[PDB]
């Protein structure tokens, strides 16, 4: 009886299912358990048809495009953990800069694997698991970790450039604050309702702005935890704090041009003056950059755990954790193509790169998509 | 048999403190005197109005 008393929240799965352009796959190959139904900051990389797919249990591959045959394949589940072949437990997403495949671990043992074979270019234990993808740029393996730390590591051996304290959430109030480089400033968001710029060159706070409060005494959403990844349009940061506060603001000082404290925002891109985002209700909206004014929107997808909104094959491709693909109109929110290529769900973002659209699904993992 | 109107009654009651207990005080020899009223057992023995017990009722 006790199981039959709890209700659920309703969704809007798929009205106006259109396929007015046909959707298909570039290849569908499924490298398997990995990303999983388990919650994972890990996310693949795609470059030059060397399709860097991997598995959180340890198996790290590189695949070939158009077939998903493996260019190379290794594992990092070798002597890890307390019983020597534990799972690797990867936190940060797949980063490939040069001949190194950098992946952050939940062991906080970050890596670099030689992109020719998968052999370890370097590997280094860091402080705290990676809340972000290990942002490897300028030699710095810039990682915002779980302990509210900015760790830049060397991308040649793993020499930690600094471990600089950041926005510290009380618990692991989630949401990736990606350490991004903009105008020489290490620009990182925050799980405390703040965004910031730190020094890229040393880890010295350029500014940190109150983009106001997060979970704790004004509790914001824990079904929709805000992507605090900053997306700067060169002079104007367009970033969310951890209550869904999109903000136009200064990069050098953080001084606000306009903001959108409106509640938690799932996923987003700042596509010119057309900010395409996965809104609060798992729904699609187009905001502008002169204000966060709705240019157009779509509420056909409600409470469908969408992926990041990308523009591929001419239209707004948003996959979901229901395994469906949806080519939304780049104009007012209409399906252009719809493809349930997966049943396991897309937890990772559509890498609409290398001519393809790469996801790593949950257990139907590597499908790569075109139209 | 005896019950003829479905009573919830013919039960116990109280009388006891209307049979108030007389008390025999100190008669002890001098020098052998103890502060025997050190407890709170010393009331103003006052007989302001009203009956005693069940004769004393109100609305």
């Amino acid at each position: 009886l006790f199981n039959s008393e709890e209700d659920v929240v309703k969704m809007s799965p798929l009205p106006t299912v259109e396929n007015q352009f046909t959707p298909t796959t570039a290849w569908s190959t499924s490298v398997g358990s990995g990303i999983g139904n388990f919650y994972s900051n890990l996310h693949p990389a795609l470059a030059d048809n060397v399709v860097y797919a991997a598995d959180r249990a340890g198996l790290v591959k590189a695949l070939n495009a158009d077939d998903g045959k493996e260019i190379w394949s290794v594992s990092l589940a070798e002597k890890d953990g307390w019983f020597s072949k534990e799972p690797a437990l990867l936190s940060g997403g797949v980063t490939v800069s040069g001949g190194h495949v950098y992946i952050g671990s939940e062991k906080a043992q970050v890596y670099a694997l030689n992109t020719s074979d998968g052999t370890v270019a370097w590997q280094t234990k860091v402080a705290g698991e990676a809340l972000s993808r290990p942002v490897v740029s300028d030699g710095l393996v810039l990682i915002h970790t779980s302990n509210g730390q900015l760790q830049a590591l060397n991308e040649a051996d793993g020499a930690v450039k600094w471990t600089v304290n950041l926005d510290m959430p009380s618990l692991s109030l989630r949401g990736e604050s990606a350490p991004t480089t903009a105008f020489g400033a290490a620009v990182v968001g925050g799980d405390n309702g703040r965004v910031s710029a730190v020094l890229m060159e040393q880890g010295q706070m350029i500014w940190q702005q109150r983009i106001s409060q997060a979970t704790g005494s004004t509790e914001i959403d824990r079904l929709s935890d805000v992507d605090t990844t900053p997306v700067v349009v060169n002079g104007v940061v367009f970033a969310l704090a951890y209550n869904g506060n999109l903000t136009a603001l200064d990069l050098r000082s953080g001084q606000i041009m306009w903001k959108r404290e409106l509640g938690s925002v799932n996923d987003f891109i700042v596509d010119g003056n057309r900010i395409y985002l996965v809104d609060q209700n798992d729904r699609v909206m187009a905001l502008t950059i002169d204000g966060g004014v709705t240019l157009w929107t779509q509420s056909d997808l409600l409470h469908r755990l969408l992926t990041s909104p990308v523009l591929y094959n001419g239209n707004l491709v948003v996959g979901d954790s229901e395994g469906y693909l949806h080519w939304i109109n780049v104009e007012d929110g209409r399906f252009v193509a719809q493809q349930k290529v997966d049943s396991s769900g897309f937890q990772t973002e559509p890498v609409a790169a290398d001519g393809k659209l790469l996801i790593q699904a949950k257990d139907g993992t590597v499908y790569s998509i075109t139209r | 048999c005896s019950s003829d109107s479905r009573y919830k009654r013919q039960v116990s009651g109280d009388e006891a403190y209307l049979e108030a207990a007389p008390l025999a005080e100190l008669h002890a020899p001098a020098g052998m005197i103890l502060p025997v009223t050190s407890g709170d057992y010393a009331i103003p023995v006052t007989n302001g109005s009203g009956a005693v017990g069940k004769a004393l009722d109100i609305r």
């Binding site: - | 025999a24 025997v36 023995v45 302001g48 109005s49 004393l56």
Partner: protein, 218 residues
């Protein structure tokens, strides 16, 4: 109980069932009167009639909250003497309610927690209202109550004699001494301190008690 009615007719139905003896259903009025009209003029007297009805319907903690209410609701009132009396009168009835009295079984050896609390209220009556409508009544309680709490502590102090705890005999009956100057349980404890002295070889201290035995024989 009673819906949103004229407050007097709820009281009239209360004054019916108060005088019907139907405190089963008078409290059905008097609470429902105090449900929507506790600020009425007789609604303080409704609480006084609630204490009246709770007692006759044997609702002593509900009376006790209502008595404590009238401490707070009307700390200036003529019927606080009623409230002070009925608190101890509750604490009279709250302390012992067993049916063993027809079997002649003592309940003064039973726990006098509310009988000590009635010893507050009945004495706080004859202190705070030595003139009131219950002061002849409350004094009759305390005269009975003083030996009753003594026969409690007597039945305690009897046991150390039975235990042979002669150290615990004397200080208990010295406790009975300094508390109770006059009670017969202490007057029956008067030979016993002499005994424990002789069991503790305080015969010389006992023969001083034996003169007090001799002085307080009568």
């Amino acid at each position: 109980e009673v819906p949103d009615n004229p407050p007097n007719e709820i009281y009239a139905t209360a004054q019916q069932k108060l005088q019907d003896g139907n405190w089963r259903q008078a409290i059905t009025q008097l609470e429902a009167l105090d449900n929507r009209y506790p600020f009425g003029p007789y609604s303080q007297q409704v609480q006084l009639d609630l204490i009246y009805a709770y007692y006759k319907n044997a609702d002593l903690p509900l009376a006790q909250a209502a008595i404590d209410r009238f401490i707070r609701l009307n700390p200036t009132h003529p019927n606080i003497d009623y409230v002070m009396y009925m608190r101890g009168l509750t604490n009279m009835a709250l302390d012992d309610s067993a049916l063993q009295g027809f079997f002649g079984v003592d309940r003064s050896d039973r726990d006098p927690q509310h009988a000590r609390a009635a010893f507050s209220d009945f004495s706080k009556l004859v202190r705070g209202y030595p003139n009131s409508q219950y002061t002849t009544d409350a004094t009759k309680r305390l005269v009975f109550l003083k030996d009753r709490l003594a026969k409690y502590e007597y039945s305690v102090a009897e046991y150390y004699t039975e235990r042979g705890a002669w150290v615990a005999v004397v200080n208990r009956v010295e406790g009975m001494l300094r508390d109770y100057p006059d009670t017969q349980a202490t007057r029956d404890a008067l030979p016993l301190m002499e005994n424990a002295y002789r069991q503790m070889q305080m015969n010389a201290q006992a023969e001083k008690v034996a003169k007090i035995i001799a002085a307080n024989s009568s």
